Write a protein that binds this DNA or RNA. Sequence first.
RNA 1: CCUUCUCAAACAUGUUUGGUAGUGAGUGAUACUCGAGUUAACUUGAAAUUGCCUUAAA
Lengths: 247, 51, 133, 268, 282
Amino acid sequence: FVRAESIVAKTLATSREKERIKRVSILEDKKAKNETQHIASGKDFILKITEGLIREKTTYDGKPALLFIVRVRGPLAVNIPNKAFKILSLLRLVETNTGVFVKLTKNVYPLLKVIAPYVVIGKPSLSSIRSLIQKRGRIIYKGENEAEPHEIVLNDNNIVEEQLGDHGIICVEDIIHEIATMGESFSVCNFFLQPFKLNREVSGFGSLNRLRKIKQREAESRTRQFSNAATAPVIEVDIDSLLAKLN
Amino acid sequence: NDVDPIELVVFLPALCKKMGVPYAIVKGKARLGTLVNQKTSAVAALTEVRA
Amino acid sequence: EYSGIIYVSRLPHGFHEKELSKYFAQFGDLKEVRLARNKKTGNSRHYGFLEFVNKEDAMIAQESMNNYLLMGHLLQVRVLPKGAKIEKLYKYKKRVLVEKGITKPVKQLKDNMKQKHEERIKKLAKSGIEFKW
Amino acid sequence: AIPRERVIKAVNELIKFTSKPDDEEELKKDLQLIVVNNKSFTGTSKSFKLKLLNVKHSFYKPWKEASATAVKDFKVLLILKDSDIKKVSEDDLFDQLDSEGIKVDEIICGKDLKTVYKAYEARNAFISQFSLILADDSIVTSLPKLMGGKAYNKVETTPISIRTHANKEFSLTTLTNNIKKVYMNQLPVKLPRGTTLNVHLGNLEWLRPEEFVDNVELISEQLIKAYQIRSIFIKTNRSPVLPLYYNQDVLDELESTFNKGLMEIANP
Amino acid sequence: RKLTRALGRGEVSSAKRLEENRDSYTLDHIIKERYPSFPDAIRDIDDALNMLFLFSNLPSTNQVSSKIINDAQKICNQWLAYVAKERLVRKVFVSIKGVYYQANIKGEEVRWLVPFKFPENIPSDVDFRIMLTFLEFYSTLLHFVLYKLYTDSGLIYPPKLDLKKDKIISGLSSYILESRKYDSPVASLFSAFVFYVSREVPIDILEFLILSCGGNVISEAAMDQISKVTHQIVDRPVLKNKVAGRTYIQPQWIFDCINKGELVPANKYLPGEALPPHLSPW
RNA sequence: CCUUCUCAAACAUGUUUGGUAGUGAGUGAUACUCGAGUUAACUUGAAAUUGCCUUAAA
């Protein structure tokens, strides 16, 4: 059975999400034309939240940056709109506990503004990148005797040498180098790597785990903010500590 | 509703009706106890509420 | 006596035609679902009608949701008498404004506004309001 | 712009029309300025932001000094941010606005609006009792959902934005300066999506006819440089319109980075 | 049971207080009962080291938690830092399963296995609860042994770690060891040597071996985040231009020199020539 | 049984510009601009009978 309260709550939340995405899209069209006489703000803001918590709202310099994007569960009782679903599917974030690397530029900022309530966005450090690749590194590889390809771990450097060696990538360390430095064949390496399947920090349904879930929800509510303001800064959190808990 | 001995609340609906007090019979003295931080509670009352 | 027609009122903001259909198809098959909406703005008038294939299903839905407290709204559900087919409840959209053409030439419309000003002057003179020109 | 003798005669005639010998003894003595534009004022976009027109003479001080014999007396509401509501108190406004005779009865915030006055009846009862509602320009954009659409059907209940932040921090001095400026020098006007715009100059007993003449002349002189107006009228309630302006030349004005980002984030 | 009662009643603050006002069991008395002698503990820590290095390499799952894995990695890094600083390694053998190290700790030969930094798949067929119980016991035992070893050497236990070096390369170099000649020739090898380890080379293995047989290591991988160089350790089929003042070699030279004890001549170890067999030291 | 655009630039604490699209129903006066768009102010329980992604899981 389905309750009328659940139906109406889903309807209202989905309508507000659609309103937010529509306003963001209108602002982004105005910014793309870049000559509109009437606009609230015409620049990109980054809200870095660190730890009792401190938030710095800076501008976006415009230079490319490296981001790690983690798909988290979205707002409650919200049917995901088509635009956000399209961007998440293109980013390969169809399911939660899944992470990707993104090269952020001026044309990447509006997509992050659109998909803000469904992802945690951070700046990954070198140690976190290396731990992520050496701990959870998977590829879709087609064996010569295999009728259909399957997903195996990134265990052999010979496979890397025979798939990306022509681009100049011989090993996992070279993949790590290109991902970290945002250099040549960054897209090639980032799509050779499968999306990273992280494990949940709190799992189970005993009393200890339910109390830990309560604490985790409290912490996430304190950290993450839903501005719904059509000019909201992209929020950057401590992805190092997040990946330390998730891996 | 599940008060034993029942005489402790058997007069309460009639008293509430005579005094014009809105009342409701609910299932669970244990539920009322969780309301008032007790194991059980035979009754609960809202007297003054916030704006 | 009684029909298979249900009148619902004191609806919340999010309760619309598809929501009512999805909720009451659980109670039974629905011939038609309509919602009273405003003509110029796309806003609900907080009431509507539904029609069950089975009047028994309509009566069950009424005795189920007659006084249902929902998001601060105490819903009201009535079973309509025999007949009274639901009609003239169009799903309006949000209308918009747009400037049309003006076939009157500039000279004609300026002359018309000057004649209107003269008529205002005549009205002021008739009223005993001594305004110049 | 507007002839002084013409506007003096118009104001004298309108004040003479009321004093020929319910709410009939209160609403029929309100002076209104009608401005008729060639095209739509704001355009195709509905506007809820009130335009502030700055004048020489005070407008709310006569309202306060005349509300002593009014059933609905003069009231000012101040709206501030949730993080800013704890930095100020009623003494901090009294000591800074007592010199000019400015009093703020109630200060609320968005949390107060969303919790205390969530219900429509309580919200209407709270909103309708104030005559000048001022809001921080930070929180003014959320107010169509908080104060509702019934609060925007009147000029006096439509919120006014003020600049309470100086150098990206809330400043009591800047707040008081903006409040004083709004109270003394400027007036609120509703810009419509049509062509007919209404300005409430106030009551006939609030100010002298000379003050009304000076205020309306300054309003016309500012509005001419603001927008290309077409016609100007002065009226009282239940009275016709007295024209004051006529011009001709303003009439003849009648006659993929999204896909770039998708390409950047997609490999094939 | 009482926490379940608090959560069921909806008293979340009381549940938090109940969770805070609890004390877990410890295994120190069991450690002292089972190992009356520090040499006995030293002669039994081999399986403990193997299990800890295995569990420091796994990814977090539903059964194996990030806190447990991070604690195991921390204690493994402490052990590696102590061995590197006291310069106690004697034998190294790189087999396809992993790297077998043999170090002389207090006159006792201790051999352990370290897997490579690759994502090994979990069989989902093993008794993980039994293995985690063994991991708890091994962690307590190695805490006791590491405290005794650090205090005997005259160092602070536990040593503080450097946050920036931890965020650059999370290895044994992040733990700086503070206080308050070695035995020839394995420790004396690579003295006044600076090795530029190239990107393709396993940095943890090479750096630990060199630092245990003391020398300086400059890592090409660590330079990604942003003169005195003598040797450069590379492993590539095609090498670019070489500086005339730097000796270029392959990682097997380090292993063979460590197992030989002497300085095996490097003319046989070149990037463009075949290597001699990597013989087992046992 | 969800929870609301809580702000920006530019010049010297001041000045300018931009940012706000609403519960429904009803009463009403009065003028203005080409069946359309505006204009004083009054009522009401959140009122009402029909204008063709899934470990927020069992």
